[PDB]
Amino acid sequence: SVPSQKTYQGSYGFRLGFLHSGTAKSVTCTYSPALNKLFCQLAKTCPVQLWVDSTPPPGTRVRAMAIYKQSQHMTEVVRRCPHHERCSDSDGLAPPQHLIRVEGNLRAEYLDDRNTFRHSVVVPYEPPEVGSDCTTIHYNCMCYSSCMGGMNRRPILTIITLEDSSGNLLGRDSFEVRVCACPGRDRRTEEENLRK
Ligand SMILES: [Zn+2]
């Protein structure tokens, strides 16, 4: 009833990577290593890199799930707010309720867990292309952190799990997400407070 968030490289040495986008007022998506926190604008492309030390077997998949970071909310399904689930912005594949979409991948599957009712989205793992050392998935987050009735100003975590063809755990990583109007300013502000 609470998905595990424990970091776990496993046998293939799985871990995430993030681009270095800066904190300019105009940035649509930026990542803070010091806070392990991704700041992005509503429904904007969020590149997430997948890094491994060895290639996992064919049929390996990559799943993304969000949970609330505070323990008192951890048991509540993270979902889109009463407004955004009704704004008819589906891409055909993502259910309107799902906060996290994968962008530009026809093989993305969206899951509604029969037991926990949590949402997740899963894609096949593709090894890196020639001339690349990693694989990138593009994610969208489809509500603001502050959406009333939805995330409701609460911070979330996005958990990325490397899975075999049966859904058994091969690797896990995680990062905090804030969806806000101005990712650059918010990352600067929070990183200033962290030193102080
Ligand atoms: Zn919303």
Residue numbers in the entry: 96 to 291
What is the paper's account of this structure, in its own sentences?
The cavity created by the Y236C mutation was significantly larger compared with that induced by the Y234C mutation, which provides a rationale for the much more severe loss in thermal stability upon the Y236C mutation. In contrast, the Y236C mutation creates a much larger internal cavity without the collapse of neighboring side chains into the pocket. Interestingly, the sulfur atom of the mutated residue, Cys236, is located almost within the van der Waals distance of the sulfur atoms of Cys135 and Cys141 (distance of 4.1 and 4.7 Å, respectively). The latter two cysteines, together with the adjacent Cys124, have been associated with conformational instability/plasticity of the human p53 DBD and form a cryptic binding site for arsenic and antimony. The drastically different stability loss induced by the Y234C and Y236C mutation (ΔTm of 8 vs 17 °C) is particularly interesting, given that the two mutations affect the same region of the hydrophobic core. Here, ATO had a much more stabilizing effect on Y236C (maximal stabilization by 4.1 ± 1.0 °C) than on Y234C (maximal stabilization by 2.2 ± 0.5 °C). A more recent study on ATO rescue from the same group classified Y126C as partially rescuable and Y236C as not rescuable, in perfect agreement with our stability data showing that the stabilization of the Y236C mutant by ATO is small compared with the overall stability loss upon mutation. However, due to the much higher stability loss in the Y236C mutant, reactivation may be more challenging for this particular mutant, requiring a much higher gain in stability through the action of chemical chaperones than for the Y234C mutant or other mutants for which a ts phenotype and partial reactivation have been shown in cells.
The tumor suppressor p53 is inactivated by mutation in about half of all cancer cases. Most p53 cancer mutations are missense mutations clustering in the DNA-binding domain (DBD). Due to its low intrinsic stability, the human p53 DBD is very susceptible to inactivation by destabilizing mutations, resulting in unfolding, followed by rapid aggregation at body temperature. Here, we have systematically analyzed the structural and stability effects of all oncogenic Tyr-to-Cys mutations (Y126C, Y163C, Y205C, Y220C, Y234C, and Y236C) in the p53 DNA-binding domain (DBD).
